[PDB]
Homo-oligomer: A and B are copies of this chain.
Amino acid sequence: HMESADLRALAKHLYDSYIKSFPLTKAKARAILTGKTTDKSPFVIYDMNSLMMGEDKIKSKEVAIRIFQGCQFRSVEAVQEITEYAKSIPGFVNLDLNDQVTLLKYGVHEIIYTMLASLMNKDGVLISEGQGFMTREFLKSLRKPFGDFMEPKFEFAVKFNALELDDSDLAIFIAVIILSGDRPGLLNVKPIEDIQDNLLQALELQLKLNHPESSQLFAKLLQKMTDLRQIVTEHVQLLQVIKKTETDMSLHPLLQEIYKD
C-alpha cells in the first residue's frame, strides 16, 4: 500500500521516462492522423506505385518481403526502446539478472502491439516516424501468408483505441505488463509482484483521475491484456509458418532470441 501523493509521483516518473524513451508518442501520432496541419502531413502508400514513390520521398526483392522486413527492422528498434524504458521502472534493474531477461523476453511483444495501436486508425498505420502512412487495405492484400499477417493488429487496435488512453496512461500500463510475475521460468516471483502491485495501484489512481467519467476503465483495460496474449500467440504461429516456407529471410539476432522458446 502506497500513499496517494506517492502514487502520483510514480505516474509522473513513468510518463517522463516514456517521453524520453519513445520518440513517436500517441499525442504526436494522433496530431498527424487527424490532420488539419500542413507541416505534419504524411505521404500515403496504398499500392505498388505509391510504395515506389515513397522510397524517393520518405527515404531488389519482392514487395511482401520488403514490407515484412520493414516491420521487423522497426520491431527491433521498438525492442531497444522498450528495454531502455524498463530500466527506468523503479526496482526493475535491482531484480535478478536472469529475471530481467525473462520479463523482457515475454513482455516486448505485448508492448509492441499495445503501442502499435497508437499509430493506427481504422484505415492504416503510420510508418517512418510518422512521415508515412500505409493503408490497411494495401497490407490486407499482400500475397501468401503476409496479407492475413497484418490484419489482426488492426482489429485489436480499433478495439484498444476505443478506450481513448493517452500517453500518461499507457506509460503505467506498459510498466504493468513488463512486471508480470506469471512469466515462465522466473526465479523470484515475489519481488516482481510487489513492484506490479505498486504499478497497478498507480494505474488505478491514474485512470480514475484522468478519466473520471469512464466507469471501470481500470478493469476494462486489464481485460485487454487477454486480447494481447492471444495476438502474440497468433503472431508466433504465423512466424513459424513463414520460417518453414521462406528459407530466404533471416531474422535479426535479437528477434531470434526472443522467439527461442
Using CB atoms and an 8 Å cutoff, list the residues of chain A in contact with chain B: 1, 182, 197, 200-201, 204, 215-216, 218-219, 222-223, 225-227, 229-230
Contact = CB atoms under 8 A, between A and B. Distances in A.
A214 to B, nearest CB: 10
Contact of A223 (B1, B216, B222): B222
A57 to B, nearest CB: 40
Copies of the chain in the assembly: 2
A-B complex: 3 closest residue pairs judged by Cβ atoms = A226-B226, A222-B222, A200-B216
Give the interface SS of chain A, mostly helix, strand, loop or mixed. Answer: helix
A187 to B, nearest CB: 17
21 contacts: A1-B215, A182-B223, A182-B227, A197-B215, A197-B216, A200-B216, A200-B219, A201-B215, A201-B216, A204-B216, A204-B219, A218-B219, A219-B222, A222-B222, A222-B223, A223-B225, A225-B226, A226-B226, A226-B229, A229-B229, A229-B230
A216 B1 CA distance: 9
Contacts of A1: 215
A197 B219 CA distance: 9
Contacts of A219: 200, 204, 218, 222
